[PDB]
Design a protein around this motif. Sequence first.
Motif, mmCIF file in Angstrom:
data_model
loop_
_atom_site.group_PDB
_atom_site.id
_atom_site.type_symbol
_atom_site.label_atom_id
_atom_site.label_comp_id
_atom_site.label_asym_id
_atom_site.label_seq_id
_atom_site.Cartn_x
_atom_site.Cartn_y
_atom_site.Cartn_z
ATOM 1 N N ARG A 149 0.820 -1.208 0.000
ATOM 2 C CA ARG A 149 0.000 0.000 0.000
ATOM 3 C C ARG A 149 0.856 1.261 0.000
ATOM 4 O O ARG A 149 0.739 2.107 -0.894
ATOM 5 C CB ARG A 149 -0.928 -0.013 1.215
ATOM 6 C CG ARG A 149 -1.676 1.286 1.463
ATOM 7 C CD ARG A 149 -2.664 1.107 2.594
ATOM 8 N NE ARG A 149 -2.018 1.161 3.898
ATOM 9 C CZ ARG A 149 -1.909 2.248 4.649
ATOM 10 N NH1 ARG A 149 -2.429 3.405 4.275
ATOM 11 N NH2 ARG A 149 -1.271 2.170 5.814
ATOM 12 N N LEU A 150 1.716 1.413 1.004
ATOM 13 C CA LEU A 150 2.481 2.634 1.209
ATOM 14 C C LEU A 150 3.875 2.579 0.594
ATOM 15 O O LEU A 150 4.707 3.432 0.915
ATOM 16 C CB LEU A 150 2.594 2.941 2.706
ATOM 17 C CG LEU A 150 1.299 3.172 3.484
ATOM 18 C CD1 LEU A 150 1.605 3.522 4.927
ATOM 19 C CD2 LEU A 150 0.503 4.282 2.839
ATOM 20 N N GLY A 151 4.150 1.617 -0.280
ATOM 21 C CA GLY A 151 5.395 1.655 -1.024
ATOM 22 C C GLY A 151 6.602 1.658 -0.112
ATOM 23 O O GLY A 151 6.623 0.998 0.932
ATOM 24 N N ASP A 152 7.627 2.418 -0.499
ATOM 25 C CA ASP A 152 8.831 2.500 0.319
ATOM 26 C C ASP A 152 8.531 3.156 1.656
ATOM 27 O O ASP A 152 9.151 2.830 2.672
ATOM 28 C CB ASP A 152 9.916 3.284 -0.414
ATOM 29 C CG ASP A 152 10.191 2.742 -1.800
ATOM 30 O OD1 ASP A 152 9.544 1.747 -2.188
ATOM 31 O OD2 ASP A 152 11.047 3.317 -2.505
ATOM 32 N N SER A 153 7.590 4.097 1.663
ATOM 33 C CA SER A 153 7.233 4.796 2.887
ATOM 34 C C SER A 153 6.660 3.865 3.949
ATOM 35 O O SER A 153 6.649 4.232 5.128
ATOM 36 C CB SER A 153 6.230 5.895 2.557
ATOM 37 O OG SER A 153 4.995 5.317 2.188
ATOM 38 N N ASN A 181 -6.927 3.312 2.443
ATOM 39 C CA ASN A 181 -6.692 2.620 1.186
ATOM 40 C C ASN A 181 -6.641 3.552 -0.017
ATOM 41 O O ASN A 181 -5.928 3.260 -0.981
ATOM 42 C CB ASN A 181 -7.778 1.568 0.978
ATOM 43 C CG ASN A 181 -7.684 0.446 1.981
ATOM 44 O OD1 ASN A 181 -8.692 -0.118 2.398
ATOM 45 N ND2 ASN A 181 -6.465 0.092 2.349
ATOM 46 N N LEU A 182 -7.347 4.678 0.024
ATOM 47 C CA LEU A 182 -7.549 5.514 -1.149
ATOM 48 C C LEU A 182 -7.023 6.938 -1.013
ATOM 49 O O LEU A 182 -6.966 7.648 -2.023
ATOM 50 C CB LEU A 182 -9.045 5.561 -1.493
ATOM 51 C CG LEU A 182 -9.807 4.240 -1.422
ATOM 52 C CD1 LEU A 182 -11.218 4.448 -1.903
ATOM 53 C CD2 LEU A 182 -9.122 3.196 -2.280
ATOM 54 N N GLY A 219 6.736 2.847 -5.103
ATOM 55 C CA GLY A 219 6.228 1.530 -4.776
ATOM 56 C C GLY A 219 4.752 1.470 -4.464
ATOM 57 O O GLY A 219 4.288 0.456 -3.934
ATOM 58 N N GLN A 220 3.997 2.516 -4.780
ATOM 59 C CA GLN A 220 2.554 2.551 -4.569
ATOM 60 C C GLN A 220 1.882 2.449 -5.932
ATOM 61 O O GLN A 220 1.944 3.390 -6.731
ATOM 62 C CB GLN A 220 2.134 3.829 -3.846
ATOM 63 C CG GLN A 220 2.856 4.067 -2.540
ATOM 64 C CD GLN A 220 2.290 5.238 -1.774
ATOM 65 O OE1 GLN A 220 1.379 5.914 -2.244
ATOM 66 N NE2 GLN A 220 2.829 5.486 -0.588
ATOM 67 N N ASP A 224 -8.702 0.082 -9.987
ATOM 68 C CA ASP A 224 -8.097 0.637 -8.779
ATOM 69 C C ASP A 224 -8.065 -0.482 -7.746
ATOM 70 O O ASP A 224 -9.087 -0.794 -7.128
ATOM 71 C CB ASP A 224 -8.876 1.845 -8.268
ATOM 72 C CG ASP A 224 -8.170 2.558 -7.136
ATOM 73 O OD1 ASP A 224 -8.516 3.727 -6.864
ATOM 74 O OD2 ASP A 224 -7.261 1.961 -6.527
ATOM 75 N N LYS A 225 -6.892 -1.085 -7.559
ATOM 76 C CA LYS A 225 -6.790 -2.203 -6.630
ATOM 77 C C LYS A 225 -7.099 -1.742 -5.214
ATOM 78 O O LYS A 225 -7.720 -2.472 -4.431
ATOM 79 C CB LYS A 225 -5.392 -2.822 -6.688
ATOM 80 C CG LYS A 225 -5.118 -3.687 -7.921
ATOM 81 C CD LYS A 225 -5.186 -2.901 -9.233
ATOM 82 C CE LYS A 225 -4.125 -1.801 -9.297
ATOM 83 N NZ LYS A 225 -4.433 -0.785 -10.333
#
Lengths: 488, 488, 163, 163
Positions: free
Chosen positions: B39-43, B331-332, B343-344, B352-353
């Motif tokens: 969800r939040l990628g690298d963050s 989520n959105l 990475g998001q 929209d997953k």
Amino acid sequence: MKLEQQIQRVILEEAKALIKDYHEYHNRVHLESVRNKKRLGDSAPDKKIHRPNYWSFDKKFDPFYVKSNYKSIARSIANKIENRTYLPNEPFTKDVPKPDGGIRKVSIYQIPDAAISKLFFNRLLAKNRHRFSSFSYAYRNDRNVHFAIQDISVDLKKNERTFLAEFDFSDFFGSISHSFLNEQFNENGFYISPEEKFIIRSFLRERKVGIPQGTSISLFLANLTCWKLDQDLEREGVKFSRYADDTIIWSQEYSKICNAFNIITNFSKSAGIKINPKGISLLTKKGLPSEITSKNNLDFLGYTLSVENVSIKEKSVKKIKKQISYILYRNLIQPLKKTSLAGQTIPANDRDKNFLIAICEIRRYMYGGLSKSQIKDYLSGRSNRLYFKGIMSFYPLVNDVEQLKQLDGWIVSVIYRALKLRCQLLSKWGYNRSHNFPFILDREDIVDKCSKKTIAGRKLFEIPSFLLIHKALQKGLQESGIEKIMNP
Amino acid sequence: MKLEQQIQRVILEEAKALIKDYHEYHNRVHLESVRNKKRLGDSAPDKKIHRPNYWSFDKKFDPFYVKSNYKSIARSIANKIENRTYLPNEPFTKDVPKPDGGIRKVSIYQIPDAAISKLFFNRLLAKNRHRFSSFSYAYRNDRNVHFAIQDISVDLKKNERTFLAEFDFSDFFGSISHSFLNEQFNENGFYISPEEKFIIRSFLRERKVGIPQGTSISLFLANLTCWKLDQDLEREGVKFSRYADDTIIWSQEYSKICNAFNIITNFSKSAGIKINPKGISLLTKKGLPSEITSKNNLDFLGYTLSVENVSIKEKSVKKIKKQISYILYRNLIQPLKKTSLAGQTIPANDRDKNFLIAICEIRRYMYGGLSKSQIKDYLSGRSNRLYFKGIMSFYPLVNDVEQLKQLDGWIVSVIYRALKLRCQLLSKWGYNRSHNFPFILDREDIVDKCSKKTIAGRKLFEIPSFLLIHKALQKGLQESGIEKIMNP
Amino acid sequence: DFSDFFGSISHSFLNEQFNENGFYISPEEKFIIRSFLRERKVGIPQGTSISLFLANLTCWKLDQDLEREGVKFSRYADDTIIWSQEYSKICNAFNIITNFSKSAGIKINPKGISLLTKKGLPSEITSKNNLDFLGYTLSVENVSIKEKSVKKIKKQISYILYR
Amino acid sequence: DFSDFFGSISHSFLNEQFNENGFYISPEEKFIIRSFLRERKVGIPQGTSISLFLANLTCWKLDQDLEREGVKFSRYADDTIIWSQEYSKICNAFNIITNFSKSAGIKINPKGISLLTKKGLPSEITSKNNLDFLGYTLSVENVSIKEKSVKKIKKQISYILYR
RNA sequence: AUUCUCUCAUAGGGAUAACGGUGUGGCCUUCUACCUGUUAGAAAUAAUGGGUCUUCAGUUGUAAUUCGUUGCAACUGACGGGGGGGUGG
């Protein structure tokens, strides 16, 4: 889990239980016929295995047939329920005389119908339990009735003056408008699904008026019908218990009990049918007087409940004495009052086998077969568990030591007298045995001498005592509760 | 069955259950951290598996250690019980702020002590069940509290004018003289064995005054202390329910509620500790006026009960809205409010997953994951069973269709608005997606369009509706009851 | 407030009560009672030596009825306070007072009815958490000096210092 | 307000009352009652010759219950007023009316409950010192003409002079 | 046939002699104080065959005591009806 599978399960289990009961019946008859041959010699009659008569009225009453075709039976029953055409067959009914002079209509539904009744109405009772009153019971043999007895007993002690009243609901359930029942279906938060409503209406349609009593569906329909009577009585502050066709309402106030009478009359009018008292009295500490017609004892099933104690009712004590006396008569007198003593062992060598058989029969009837060593092991701490069976398992709330002490004396006296008449009859036949062990003991010596005798290392002559097992019962009620002793 | 074997069984099961809970905890954390990385990628932050802090306060709090040496633990506990030297260790207590401004003293006994408490006080409650009042509960999460709610609800409907009163028993149980408790041991027909009395006195000796609240022994000692208050209130004709440290008494008469106030005061004086109301009011049909201070709504746990309907309390609705809104935010919106979108996955190709994840999370929170096809299969007759989970499993008695309809509208509106802000943020980052499926639907089109979309042949976009599962709840309460739907 | 009762009570009612409730009034004492009532025309002279006897003799049936109702009460001069733990009881006491008023041919009016509760706790009926009994404010928690009395005390101390 | 009771009262309930409370209804009278009820479907025709009989026959048990409670009452058309000197009695009458409503399968709703006291004297419960009974305002002190009736009288006199 | 199996099955078809239980005794194992021969054995015990009490109430001494009570001695108080006919105090 489809309805057909459920029906098959319940029908198969009902039939299987009835088949087990019959198998044990004829096996017991054979064992008893062996012992009776040994007892009555050639005069002993022959075995006659019966089959419950209603088994032949219809083939679905017979457990063996129902087990034969329970799959087809359940298939058809499930289709009939789903098509809303199911109607239970006619119960094999048998009206029986009641002590008051009325008739208790015993109703035996056929095995499939009774299995359906259990399957559905047990679910209904489980899902609507908290909507019902505390002390509502369907059978007078229901074990949980003892809890209601406990309640009344406790109050009759704490409240040293209690106004009680008793009622008969027999005509109410014999003829209750089915319209009234159908009206109650959607009141009081009851949860009855449409199919359960269909089954209720089907069992009512097989009937015309009234609720079938002493059946699986009795408790639900009775509680559903009397739910407003219970709510009104609970708002009045009166405590009450309904068991089968009887109701007892008690309070500490006279106004309350009279208002309860009015409530019952109004509910009778709303039902289109009358409820009549057996009626109203005061229970007070013995010795203390009373204003209104008063009684210091109340007969609740096989109990006499008083402000001071819980005792066994006089009819129940007579029944117990009848069983013990007949044990001794059958084992020690009847065989010797026959025309011939052919094949009947005669007491000799200071051993009377008939006396051992009689003492053991009384021990089973009273203790369940427990030895006094076992009971004292339990009462001391040595044993952590004692099985409670026999007559006293049906009177777990008795706390009258004097009654049990008197019954102990009665047992010893009857043993002495029956043994004495046995010696007399034996001498009449030609056997002089007054000097032998069984017939030489004085009444004040029977208990000690029998306590000392040992066969196979086990004291099987000890005269059973109600007081010992009463102590054991008190310990087991303070250790397990009513439910545990009543059914292990 | 010796006492040591019983202690070993119970301690082993408690420790095993806690170990299973911890295992599922860290497994869940890992799965959630995988999804949060996506969800939040690298963050996305890193996983941090905790262990309950109290595990380190003592080693017998830790389930793993207790499982390590449960045989020795039970051996010593059994010897201590038999030699009458057992004393529970100090519960790890944590007093917590209450909404009224008081403190709810949470108490966690060590695993052996809690196992002993269950083993003994569950037996005591079972064996004295019929001596207790109907609606007495120890925890406010007790599922059976709903039965009490049902009762009050039913009355508030049948009685169109009901006088109610609420009380707080917190200080009673915080400081109740242990002498009073010990006096009650041999009253009201209670069956407490000598060893059970020793365990009661031992848990009370580890304490000094008061009953430990929110524990295994809470209900028994509460009912045992409040047995006379229940008896007097039942004779007054008032109906009542105690849940944790709260009590609600309702009646159709004002004099009754006032007399109940007097009863509670007298029982407080007998106890040497005071009970204070939260206090007294009249519930009437909406629109109809009232003479005394009146309220047309009563807050019973997560319910608002009124003469007309049972609805979800406003705080419970705010909490439901909080959870749904945070699902959609997390989520959105949240991932896109981060410093970098590394990475998001960005919505594209009309997919929209994050929206599928949010809709499924809301369905789990609400339905438990049921599809509207499943609920309609259950509501039509096609399915004979539906699992009832999610938020609505905690509000099974709700019958306010307007509230659920309003929450449906709110869900749709929040979905639209969150998707709109997500489109705005995405366009800010550089991604124009207003034409794509997730962001093109008007509020009056979201439900239909989502109902039509199918992924893997399963409609996983359908917007969860409270009214559908409410219909299912009604059918399942008419088919199984409160107990079945609350726990399957 | 019983002020109008004692200002105008039928002397016939008083004379009727003379031989009820076990009262012992000798013929000479009856003559003196009737003489003091004859100097008056209707009503009992208040704040006098004869006030308490004639008031108690007149209100003996009201006291008995209120005592059977279970209400507790106190009459001081032309004032009466009736308290109970039940609302029905106080309303029935109101009815009793009205009936006794009718029997007397003269009316008793409230100053009227309220509920005293622990402070903080709410009330159903109109409620007050403080009752002014003479120079006292009596509450479920404490007995304090009435606000008028505290003002009077402050007045005296302040005037001492001023003077 | 009994309006909906009479608009929809189960005719089964009416027919059940035919043979209760000592009522003397001949078979032909029963036929005429049933015929007028058959022309209708549910409820009693109001403002008609048959209204009073069927209303009294339907409400005979409510009247008996209220009379046993000690409350006094009057039903006029679709209106009912119940008065008592006790609060418990009026609340019990509320309960009686609700129970009778359930027995009839139709609900009766209040317009609801109040206390009438002498003017000036206070009250505990919601109170009113005037009751509108038809064209009358009835108070503890006087019987007067209702304000609407006075407005109607003034309207007529004013219009005579205007015309 | 009460066993096994088929029929849109609360009833009808077939095929095989089995199915379902009971008392006694054996092992498994749930709990069970003390004293003893006599079998094994190096005093660790086991199977065996004989025996004793084991409960409740009060008083007193003693130890704990959060002031409900609790452990231990050790003394007596109960711990096997009623009735009929004679008969002694």
